[model samples]
Target: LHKEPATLIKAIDGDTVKLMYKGQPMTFRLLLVDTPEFNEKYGPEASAFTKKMAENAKKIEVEFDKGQRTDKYGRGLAYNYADGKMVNEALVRQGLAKVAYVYKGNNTHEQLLRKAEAQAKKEKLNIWS
Candidate 1:
């Protein structure tokens, strides 16, 4: 339910990012959001959006829900925030991402994520279009 400040090292595609954490660089997966892979057709746009936000934010943070902290690749599993706004929800709203990888009882932000996705669908944004 708490978070750590982060500094962007790079945007690793849309859902994962490289950041300076705990005095070292680490990759953190945007927990429960799935976006196009780096080689996917829409990945470039999704990634650039993330990069733009990261680069422009006055501050960033890695916020965790009530769940595990790391995945098999050792990437931190957490939600990301830029200047106090939740990045996960934003991506879904833009239709560049979908709410995925959810583990029942180990998740929060479901309401926000699903709501964003719903709005995106209604608007027929990107993936929904």
Candidate 2:
């Protein structure tokens, strides 16, 4: 498997994380399905959960959509899949992440993530509990 060395920089709430990928001096916005904010209760726990996952990541597969690869800030707007599952959606499905979709476009992962978030809320998983 391919190995990538990266540092975890900013923790945007419990679900989202901004990190530099491959030492490119660029930030990668990992779409964490929808967890609580840092100020909210159980936020720290979610963040810590994310930290653990990040540390265990070995190779990352990038998924991008046409006309939606990068944001205005130049951050690569790509989906990160670790192991064999979509990292962002996996987080939500496992109750460690929440779906955060700001755009109104038809994103492939958006619907799936929504379903995962709904199920997590219904099941009262992790922070949701």
Candidate 3:
């Protein structure tokens, strides 16, 4: 049971999005990536891009591996998917976001994020150049 595709809205930040999943309103956090500060140059773009992706997603899946379902801040800490790819990974791969590892969970996608950062830096996609 998950949010209807129509209910999945855009991400408000690097980690959080608004949607109605399983009849419940939720703001799911992308457990792996973090972008610039809200006031930073790429911050808004990152946020906007995430929101766009989420809103346009055909299907949404949440994966909870470590920690509570929601973080201390009350956002759901889960790996999210849209159209079969990991939303967080997609953000990083496009150079619109970065891996945020403040927590020790570390999980499995950190390396992929590092690769994404390298690629973004080499391609000069965002601030990496």
Candidate 4:
């Protein structure tokens, strides 16, 4: 896999976090997953869920697509991994997030994200409720 090893620092929100990558720590926006803003209805719960996940996170890693590495705000863009699983997938599956921001070829795990979101939607979980 074209993934890079990383150490999760802390969750900024549901879909964003800071991590140590290549000896550097920076904020990363989890690709293909979009969570609510801090002021939104489910925002706090979303953040808390991800924060809780981070507390137990292990073997963190990141995988960037060929399209873009950083966004306009200078945040790194990639699919997040923790404990051998994609954290992005978990968030969507839980309904705290939705599959989004797919800029064409930048879809590394688009299929996975979509399926998770669909399941969460079908189950009427969290944001989908």
Candidate 5:
């Protein structure tokens, strides 16, 4: 895991965020979770939920995977944390997102996220309901 500190610029969606990394702008697609498209059902709710989480975060720490530095869209694939709490896992636990997009040997939070997703599903929370 490569750790980098950044400033939270904005939340593009539930699983995507814009950040300022070392005085340059960068986009991060949060790893281990996927939310609905902006036009799909519960999409706006997911976006809003992400924005609320970002609002509480002034500085964020990003953990990058060892296999891929960036996606095809030039967005960094990472797990974002604020105040030591993992935002990726939080979204899944809240049922605003699902554990998905697994990349073999590249995912560090797979098991934790899967467990969170299962719990959310079992509880029928938010989008899972």
Candidate 6:
């Protein structure tokens, strides 16, 4: 699917965000990455980092995964970009998140994220530490 231009209105947590897409509000869940829960250790730090990234972004983009757009919760499952960088990958690279929910046929970006997670683990960064 083609990527759509969007503006992040709020970061709900490390992996969830509220955004304006084509002038309508939508809930987006970052694909292929999961962070700690708000009550879990490092959760607050992850959320804060994600919020800072999104809030400081001059441009944000959302791209849906092929054949799947939203989760059962009706939240859009997508790859998020901020200032031309992939936020999902950034979180993994920073060790604030780990790769998750990867399905064999649905994972085009999986390798890149997995590599990021591996690198973070090797460096003992954030959660990896």
Worst 10 residues of 1 by lDDT: 103-112
Writing each residue's lDDT as its tens digit, candidate 5 over 1-129 gives 767888888779888989988788999999878999889887888898888777787668888887787899999888988867888999899898988899986788899999999999999998889
- Give a tens-digit lDDT track for model 4, residues 36-104: 999998999889987877668768888998888999998999888777678889999999998888898
Candidate 5 positional error at 68, Å: 0.1
Better of 4 and 6 by lDDT: 6
Best by lDDT: 6
Give the per-residue lDDT digits (tens) of candidate 6, residues 47-99. 99889999999989998877577888988888999988999999999999989
Please give, for residues 38-93, the per-residue lDDT of candidate 3 as tens digits: 68878887888777777777677776755566777777777777787777887888
Candidate 5 contains a number of clashing pairs equal to: 0
TM-score of 3: 0.81
TM-score comparison, 2 vs 5, better candidate: 5
Please give the distance, in angstroms, between residue 10's alpha carbon in candidate 5 and its true position after superposition.
1.8
Clashing pairs in 1: none
lDDT winner, 5 or 6: 6
- List the candidate 1 regions with Cα displacement exceeding 4 Å: none
Model 6 has a clash total of 0
**Residue-wise lDDT of candidate 1 within 1-111, one digit each (tens)?**
787898989878798889998878999999879999879867888898888888899899988788788888999888999998888888999999999999875478888
Taking all chains together, each candidate's TM-score versus the true structure is 0.95, 0.69, 0.81, 0.94, 0.93, 0.95
Q: Give all candidate RMSDs, comma-separated.
A: 1.1, 4.1, 3.2, 1.1, 1.2, 1.2
